[PDB]
Amino acid sequence: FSATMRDGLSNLARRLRFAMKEGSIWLGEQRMILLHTAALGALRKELVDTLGMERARGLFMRMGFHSGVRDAELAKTMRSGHSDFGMLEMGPCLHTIEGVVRVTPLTVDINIAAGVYHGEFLWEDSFEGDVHRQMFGVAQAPVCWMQIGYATGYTSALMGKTILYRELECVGCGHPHCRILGKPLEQWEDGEAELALYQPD
């Protein structure tokens, strides 16, 4: 049901090592845990309840940003014999293997050497959208915060420039699926202020 993503998914699960003789999981050179979405949901609930939705959104986008940046490093380890899109597409694949979301590239214009990027993707079965509705009910703006942070971090680390993403539709809002658009910071009218969300204090 996927292409060319298949190759990516196969070539990636081999970088995924489950070692219950040591109680660890490694993906590439990054240690991972399996975490219940319901536990991340409970954390999110307390964060929004005591910090507010905006600051909580920031914490999650940054957490996602860190994940994406690490996965881009893994992506760059197997660049040999890989087009710019083929390297880009690893993000979508890693996002799927980690059970975060089913990603389908809709159309992608990417040139790393030239600094050109324009990407739109479909997101099916976002864990974050579902978790949010269960904790909060329907939302009045897209809620896949960690997931957007990840696309932003992964793509930016890959390009060596800031690529910001925005959800144009989201299941958290009661759509059938999520859909996103990513492009250079410069090209977003209020980009500099979105950028403020990725900084800690």
Binding Zn ion by CB under 5 A: which of 75, 93, 144, 146? 144
173 is an annotated ligand-binding site residue: no
Query: Between residues 23 and 176, which has the closer beta carbon with respect to its own copies?
Result: 23
Q: What is the DSSP letter of 98?
A: T
Q: Which amino acid is at 196?
A: A
The verdict on whether residue 144 carries a ligand-binding annotation is: yes
Place of tokens 């760059």: 76
- Considering CB distances under 5 to 8 angstroms, the limit depending on partner class, which of its own copies, Zn ion, none binds residue 163? none
Bridge partner list, 107: 120
Torsion angle (degrees, nearest 10) of CA 16, 20, 21, 23: 90
Shortest CB 93 distance to its own copies, Å:
8
Closest of 198, 201, 177, 166 to residue 62, by C-alpha: 198
Number of residues that bind Zn ion (CB under 5 A): 5
What crossing angle do the helices spanning 53-76 and 145-159 adopt, rounded to 10°? 40
For its own copies, the closer of residues 172 and 184 by Cβ is: 172
**Comparison of 9 and 181: residue with beta carbon closer to its own copies:** 9
Pick what 20 binds: its own copies, Zn ion, none; C-beta below 5 to 8 Å, kind-dependent.
its own copies
155 binds, among its own copies, Zn ion, none (CB under 5 to 8 A by kind): none
Taking CA 137 as the corner, what is the angle to CA 131 and CA 142, rounded to the nearest 5 degrees?
Answer: 70
* CA gap 171, 165 in Å, rounded: 16
Out of 104, 126, 155, 156, name the contact with Zn ion by CB under 5 A. Answer: 126
Question: Which option in its own copies, Zn ion, none does residue 70 bind, with CB closer than 5 to 8 A by kind?
Answer: its own copies
Q: Is 167 annotated as a binding residue?
A: yes
Peptide bond into 4 cis (omega under 30): yes
Q: Answer yes or no whether residue 129 interacts with Zn ion by CB under 5 A.
A: yes
For the annotated binding site, the residues are 144, 167, 170, 178
* Annotated binding-site positions for Zn(2+): 144, 167, 170, 178
